[PDB]
Design a protein around this ligand. Structure first.
Ligand code: 29A
Ligand code: 29B
Length: 337
């Protein structure tokens, strides 16, 4: 066990191994506090995330386990992975804090969009990276569900990694079927989000800036049209059909006209990602092969993930049990070296 050192940063206590120096708060990492730091052992700048109240309730305990399991599984260039995981606790009974560390990226997609006009060439590279990461995540039967600019970390080399997977209004990038509360959505809910993100990078404005679930749905339908007959046939909810069918019917817009001066190849891809009926949307794998990514696409360098065991998701355990499982995972961790 390494030697730990304690300090206080913004009301939060940080007890980390001496190997990590110069901790500096950067922001909220979704249910956790994050500090940029220097890893004296590797010489790399890293981000360290301290989970907040990891075992406060059964929900928190299961979420803590879930996050650790997901991070230990992800080993891809465009997906946040783990360099180290630790706790200052010397025993299970004492175990009450979890710290996760990854390579520091330093910015998010929003820090690249605001008052900044990216070239079509840049959009190709950024979206290519998101899709390469999604192909990997999706191959593990994991759905991100909340893809947005703030969950896309980007470094100075314009390299990108997806963070907060499987765990700036969030509603703006949500698939319409989610706004409708459909419980049987598929992985293309993530493709919808990519489409909203790509459109935003090309235009400089949020594609669908809804003020609530209702407004969000309305803005989406104005562009992609209200449901056609084939899609309407798939809606089981009487209440959903009443609301949707009572709306003034709207045709799908042209897209070539909506996105006027954008690369026609980008418009074509946008049409395939933003198809209303989720069963007709392009997959991450198919998108990678689209002509828009010709200068980046390589089928031999777009890896799939090893199988991921999500069976625990259906289990109802006690807090102490989720805690013990998480402790087991912290101890069995083997760093990249
Ligand atoms: C998205 C962002 C924006 C700006 C800055 C930043 O340094 N700027 C200062 C304030 O904006 C840092 C970040 N930023 C935030 N979280 C990051 O990772 C969180 C994280 C996830 C999993 C782990 F296992 C360990 C972690 F720690 C990274 Cl890897 C990052 O890069
Ligand atoms: F207004 C609507 C109606 C339907 C969708 C929708 C898009 N893809 N799949 C569905 C869907 C919704 C409910 N049940 C089955 C499919 C979205 C918004």
């Amino acid at each position: 066990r390494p030697t730990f050192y304690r300090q206080e940063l913004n009301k939060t206590i940080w007890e980390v191994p001496e190997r990590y120096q110069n901790l500096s708060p950067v922001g909220s990492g979704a249910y956790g506090s994050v500090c940029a730091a220097f890893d004296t052992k590797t010489g790399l700048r890293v981000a360290v995330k301290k989970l907040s109240r990891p075992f406060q309730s059964i929900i928190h305990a299961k979420r803590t386990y879930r996050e650790l399991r997901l991070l230990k599984h992800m080993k891809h260039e465009n997906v946040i992975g783990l360099l180290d995981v630790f706790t200052p606790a010397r025993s299970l009974e004492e175990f009450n804090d979890v710290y996760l560390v990854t390579h520091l990226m330093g910015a998010d997609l929003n820090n690249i969009v605001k008052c900044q006009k990216l070239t079509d060439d840049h959009v190709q590279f950024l979206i290519y990276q998101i899709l390469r990461g999604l192909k990997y995540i999706h191959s593990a039967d994991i759905i991100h569900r909340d893809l947005k600019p703030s969950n896309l970390a980007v470094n100075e080399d314009c390299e990108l990694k997806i963070l907060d997977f499987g765990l700036v209004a969030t509603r703006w990038y949500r698939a319409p079927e989610i706004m409708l509360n459909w419980m049987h959505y598929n992985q293309t809910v993530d493709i919808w989000s990519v489409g909203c993100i790509m459109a935003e990078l090309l235009t400089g404005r949020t594609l669908f800036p809804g003020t609530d679930h209702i407004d969000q749905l309305k803005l989406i339908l104005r562009l992609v049209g209200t449901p056609g007959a084939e899609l309407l046939k798939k809606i089981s909810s009487e209440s959903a059909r009443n609301y949707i069918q009572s709306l003034t019917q709207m045709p799908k817009m042209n897209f070539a006209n909506v996105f006027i001066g954008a690369n026609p190849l980008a418009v074509d891809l946008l049409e395939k990602m933003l198809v209303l009926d989720s069963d007709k949307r392009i997959t991450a794998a198919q998108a990678l092969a689209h002509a828009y990514f010709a200068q980046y696409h390589d089928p031999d360098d777009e890896p799939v993930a090893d199988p991921y065991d999500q069976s625990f998701e259906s289990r109802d355990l006690l807090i102490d049990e989720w805690k013990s499982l998480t402790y087991d995972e912290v101890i069995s961790f083997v760093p990249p070296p």
